[PDB]
């Protein structure tokens, strides 16, 4: 249930809300993400 909680947390993460700053972040993945990782 660990990975499940990781999903769940990363799911609730990118979904609002009214927290005065933390807006949901768009997910990338795979192609764009590798380059986004390399650009670190």
């Amino acid at each position: 249930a660990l990975f499940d909680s990781l999903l769940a947390r990363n799911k609730k993460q990118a979904e609002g809300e009214t927290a005065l700053g933390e807006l949901p972040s768009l997910q990338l993945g795979l192609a764009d993400l590798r380059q986004r990782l390399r650009k670190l």
Partner: protein, 56 residues
């Protein structure tokens, strides 16, 4: 020949009676074996769900 032929019977009977116990062991193994093998898979599973709660 009576005492001998009787003694061999009693002895071989006792041995056979012991081998019955040996067989009794042999019979009660595979089930118990599965039961045993089941354990580490669950504790290795429940330990995971705990990690989930802790991370939560």
């Amino acid at each position: 020949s009576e005492a001998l032929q009787q003694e061999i019977a009693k002895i071989d009977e006792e041995i056979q009676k012991c081998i019955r116990d040996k067989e009794a062991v042999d019979a009660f193994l595979p089930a118990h074996g599965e039961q045993l093998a089941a354990i580490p898979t669950d504790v290795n599973f429940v330990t995971r769900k705990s990690e989930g709660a802790h991370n939560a």
